[PDB]
A paper describes a structure:
Proteins in this family undergo a large scale conformational change from a compact soluble structure, where the hydrophobic residues are hidden often within a β-tongue motif, to an extended pore structure with the hydrophobic residues exposed in two extended α-helices which insert into the cell membrane.
Like the AhlB pore, the SmhB pore contained ten monomers of SmhB in two conformations (type 1 and type 2) which assemble into a ring with pseudo tenfold symmetry. Although the resolution of this structure was low, the electron density was clear and continuous for the protein chain, enabling a model to be built with residues truncated at Cβ. As seen in AhlB, the head domain of SmhB undergoes a large scale conformational change transforming from the soluble to pore forms, with the β-tongue substructure refolding to form extended hydrophobic helices to α3 and α4. The transformation from a soluble β-tongue containing structure to an extended helical pore structure seen in SmhB and modelled in SmhA, occurs in a similar way for A. hydrophila AhlB7. In order for this conformational change to occur, the C-terminal loop and helix α7 must move to free the β-tongue to form the two extended trans-membrane helices in the pore conformation (α3-α4), with the N-terminal helix (α1) also moving from parallel to α7 to an end to end packing, resulting in a narrower more compact tail. As the overall structures of the soluble and pore forms of SmhB are almost identical to those of AhlB (RMSD Cα 0.64 Å and 0.46 Å, respectively),, not surprising given the high level of sequence identity (62%), we investigated if these structural similarities also conveyed functional similarities.
Residue numbers in the entry:
A (entry chain EEE): 272 to 347
B (entry chain FFF): 27 to 211, 216 to 343
C (entry chain DDD): 22, 24 to 213, 217 to 343
D (entry chain CCC): 63 to 114
E (entry chain CCC): 167 to 213, 216 to 271
F (entry chain JJJ): 167 to 271
Write the structure that this text describes.
Amino acid sequence: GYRGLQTQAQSAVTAATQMNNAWDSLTSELETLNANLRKGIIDDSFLRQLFLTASQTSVTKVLDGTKIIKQQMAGV
Amino acid sequence: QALHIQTYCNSVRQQIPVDFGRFPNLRESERQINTGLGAARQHAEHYLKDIQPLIIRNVTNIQDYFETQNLISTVMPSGATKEQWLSALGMVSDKAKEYQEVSANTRRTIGSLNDKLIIDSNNYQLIVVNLNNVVNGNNGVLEQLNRDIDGINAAIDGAIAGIVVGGLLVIGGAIVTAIGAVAGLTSTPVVMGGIAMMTAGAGGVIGGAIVLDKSLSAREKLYRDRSQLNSEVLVASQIGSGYRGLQTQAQSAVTAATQMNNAWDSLTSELETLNANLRKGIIDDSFLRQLFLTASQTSVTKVLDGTKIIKQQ
Amino acid sequence: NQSSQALHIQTYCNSVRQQIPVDFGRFPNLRESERQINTGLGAARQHAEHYLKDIQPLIIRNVTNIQDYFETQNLISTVMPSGATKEQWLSALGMVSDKAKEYQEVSANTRRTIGSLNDKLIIDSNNYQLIVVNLNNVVNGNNGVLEQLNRDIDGINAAIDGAIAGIVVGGLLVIGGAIVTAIGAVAGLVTSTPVVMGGIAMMTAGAGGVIGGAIVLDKSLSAREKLYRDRSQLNSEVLVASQIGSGYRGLQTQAQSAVTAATQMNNAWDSLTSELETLNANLRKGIIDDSFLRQLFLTASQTSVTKVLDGTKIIKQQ
Amino acid sequence: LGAARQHAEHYLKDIQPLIIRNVTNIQDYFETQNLISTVMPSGATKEQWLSA
Amino acid sequence: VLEQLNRDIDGINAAIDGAIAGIVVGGLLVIGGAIVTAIGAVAGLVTTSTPVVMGGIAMMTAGAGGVIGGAIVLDKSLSAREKLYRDRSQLNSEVLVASQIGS
Amino acid sequence: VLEQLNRDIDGINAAIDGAIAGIVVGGLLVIGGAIVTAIGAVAGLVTAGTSTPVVMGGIAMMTAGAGGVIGGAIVLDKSLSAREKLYRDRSQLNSEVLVASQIGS
């Protein structure tokens, strides 16, 4: 049982490390957009349609995944 | 989740106290079981009389609060001062903080319930193992008894044989003695042999009866012990099945409780996000204020969902 | 009730992660089995982490980009659309053609990823099966030994009873000898020396039998004990093997299903890649076409576009 | 066993893929075949139909 | 190889039974020897019963020797039979696997 | 066929045990013979005359023990070698039947 608990923690460590890399990537991606913006490389016209298209897809798909995980813990 | 625990609670209440007083080896088992059952009962009464009701209250208050919390005026509603909007937001922020604290309180209650159930299930399992061991030992004894009972019937038949052989010897001796007597006219040796056969027949019948009465009387003691052990094992297997069923009920209730803990934890986090979204909007002047206020409006939907979710749990 | 291909693999992945390493340290015959199992389990874990942390996410990304692309380019304008130069239409088509080419290359890339995943899963399932067979062999050998033990244990109880018999017979002989000796002695105090001798002899023999039997019994149970210990040890080892074996068997099934799920995903991407190539071919032949033959290839490409949009929805479901 | 594995990988990675391509090509072909009269209006030439 | 294994496996359990036999026969021989030795000894105190005592002591000695020798063989044998059986099963599995890949 | 084989295999183990018995009985006879011979020899080194018959009986017991051990070994090697042929046929028939039951299904 203790051995199994040790494995559960080892896996949770990997899961957490993964989450750390994900946030780190998002932080870096934001910095790149900021740098792209500041230099005049993009426009607040085009970057709006970019985030709006992601919201139409990816962002909505993540928001759903969040509500789903919230239920999976509750059993609701 | 709640109904599943509510059912398991009333069910445990119906768990009757046992006296294995007839079984000397189950003395510790009975007391241990009785104590554990008593403790579980205490856990249930608390859960029923306080916990579930208190949880319902906090959720209801939260439900009413979010109900009032209309669509968020990220900019400021029509014909109001900036101070008026700030005051209303500050009031809402304060109320949310209180609600957040209440949510944390409910979680703690759930945590205690979880621990109580966990302890109950564990104690149940311990009783089951203790019982399983008793019947798994008692069934070694049972085999040695059946083997001894088989060995005892042999002596029982050996006595039955001696008793019959004696009866025949006497019967034959009488016929011989009578013949030998009529042939005396001498025929004294025939009469002697007939009397001897009669005498020996009586001796064998007497000796066998003594052995038989004693042999069945050893056999009786062994059979009594076998039956007593069989009954004790059955009783253990009876209470054992019941405890096993109770252990499952608790294991399920643990999952139900853990689920409720995660639900409250989510609501608490969602409130903290709305609070953070709110706070940063009060110390923001123009566009960044409307940004945090819109995010808080999304917070508000996330909390309203968490409410409906907890209500279902 | 049925799961999507990805969820089936996602479940199998997290499940393999939970696979604990075992030590058959007590079992001398399972030494190689344990190490082999441990190694294979370790490798499978590596396959899962990759699948979970990289593969499934990368696949999702490529599909999403494809979904967004086809969304923008929903239907091919076979005819010269309203108020445009022929060059303007040609440029737009050429741009679409170039984008499709890039998307085709991306599709081939995803397929390669799937291929690697397939191989990784295949290797995992194979190693699992190998452990199962290795285990099955151990319990199927160990159960020959178990029978010889039960047969020997049966043969041992006979000597155990034979000693018990000698001990009792000795006790009776001594008891009877004492009664006879006492009788013979009282008859010698009237004028019966042979009776006393026979009584003393019966007593002597009774003691000898009780002593000899005790020596044999203590030794016989002590041979019986060694045999029983081995029997129990083998029984436990076999049970342990049958325990881990059931688990490995379940893991093997999980991998076999994941293999089917992966193969399905490979076929899906292959279809999307082919559908893109057809649209590209339909496009290319329309740029180097006169009036009517151009609209013909452009309409076929519009049908291509629907076939790709379907392939997208299909992959999304996988 | 190694050689047999090679045979399978080829069958799976290349045969199965080529078979899949065939269906797509067929799909594209029949797509155009319908598109023939779909484009060719009322009063197209016999030569125009023959060329297509 | 499989035939040499089955022949060796037969020779392994054979010695195992041969020890089991000697241990039982040994226990009886000793038991009988003790009864005989005791009889022979009481007849030597009672006038020319030395040969009976010798035969009884010999039976006892042989009985003990068989019980001891069997125990030594058994303790040594038990580890060896398991190894042979394991190899037999492994070979059986390997042959099946080979027959499987062919099919 | 399979039943006649199991019945014959049962009949074969009896001779196999009968050889195992002769081998052990021989080992004991030799062991006892050695103890007797040694006793008879030490009694001949005080009363040369009259402890020669004991030594003879001890040597005879040893000789007979060896004879039984040798005879049994010959029988055993042959008996298992008849048993082995029967077992091989049984396994072959079992496999054939299984294969038939496989294709049959």
